[PDB]
Structure 1
Amino acid sequence: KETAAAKFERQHMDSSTSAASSSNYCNQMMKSRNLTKDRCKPVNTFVHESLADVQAVCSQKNVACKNGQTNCYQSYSTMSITDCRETGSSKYPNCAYKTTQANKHIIVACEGNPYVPVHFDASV
């Protein structure tokens, strides 16, 4: 079945663009990455960086995850990210989102060997 590492790439990586190019980014990306298949996922963050740069976070500043877990890491530098948040008109299967683009630090949880990001925790 899809690995946690793969799933992380599928849900949160967008190395193909430097930023969201329009208000529709979320709507299109959420659908294409299959995040709306079973239900409308309420929030999602896409990271506009190379895989290598994001995998490197696992070796940066160790911080506690929102749930208390201790395998989270915060990026030393800001990163280009797009936040997607479901809108008040969103209604499965027609999931709808608001697109917000920014440059922020990312916090990820890492696991495995190679030790890579498997969950997106927050941006700061």
Structure 2
Amino acid sequence: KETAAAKFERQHMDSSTSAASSSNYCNQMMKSRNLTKDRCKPVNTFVHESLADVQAVCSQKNVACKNGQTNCYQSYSTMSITDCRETGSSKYPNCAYKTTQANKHIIVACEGNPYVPVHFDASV
């Protein structure tokens, strides 16, 4: 099986680009990361920071997860992210996305030993 940690890296890390590459970034990235294989995943965030910097959020500010669990953590610093949101006219399998760049605090759920990000909860 793909581990929870690896899955978070696939779905949410893009340290290779320092900000939302082009207007086409989400369209390419949602596809290349396999977030369009079964359905068009409607929303998804990519983080443009080192793996270490994102992993470190698991020892930063403890906050309630959206589901009520207590294992979420907010970054003390803001991070470069891109939000991908499905357009009104996107129709699977031709999934279409608006690519928006921002700098925001991220909130991740962490689990395991080592204690590492396994879900992206929010950006604030």
TM-score by length of 1: 0.99
Q: Please say if 1:49 is aligned against 2:49.
A: yes
TM-aligned CA deviation for residue 31 of structure 1: 0.2
1:71-110 deviation per Cα after TM superposition (whole angstroms, max 9, x unaligned): 0000000000000000011100000001110000000000
Report deviation, 1:35.
Answer: 0.5
- Name the CA distance, whole Å, in 2 between partners of 1:69 and 1:100: 28
Shift of 1:13: 0.1
Deviating above 4 A after TM superposition, structure 1's stretches of 4 or more consecutive aligned residues are none
Partner of 2:2: 2
Deviation at 1:20, TM superposition (A): 1.2
Q: Secondary structure, in 3 states, of the residue corresponding to 1:121?
A: strand
SS at match of 1:110: strand
Residue segments in structure 2 that go unaligned for 5+ positions in a row: none
1:88 aligns with 2:88: yes
Percent of aligned pairs sharing the same letter:
100
Aligned-CA RMSD value: 0.4
How big is the shift at 1:21?
Answer: 2.0
In 1, Cα distance between the equivalents of 2:105 and 2:92?
31
CA distance in 1, matches of 2:122, 2:24: 22
* TM-score normalised per structure 2: 0.99
Query: Once the 2 structures are TM-superposed, how far is the Cα of residue 113 of structure 1 from its aligned partner?
Result: 0.3
Q: Which runs of 5+ in 1 are unaligned?
A: none
SS in 2 for 1:27: helix
Deviation per CA, 1:8-32, whole angstroms, max 9, x where unpaired?
A: 0000000100001211100000000
Number of residue pairs aligned between Structure 1 and Structure 2:
124
Alignment deviations for residues 38-75 of structure 1 (CA, whole Å, 9 cap, x no partner): 00000000000000000000000000001111000000
CA distance in 1, matches of 2:21, 2:112: 34
Query: What secondary structure is seen at the aligned counterpart in 1 of 2:38?
Result: coil
Q: Distance in 2 between matches of 1:77 and 1:13?
A: 17
Q: Distance in 2 between matches of 1:32 and 1:21?
A: 14
Equivalents in 2 of 1:66, 1:39: separation in Å? 23
Structure 2 match to 1:58: 58
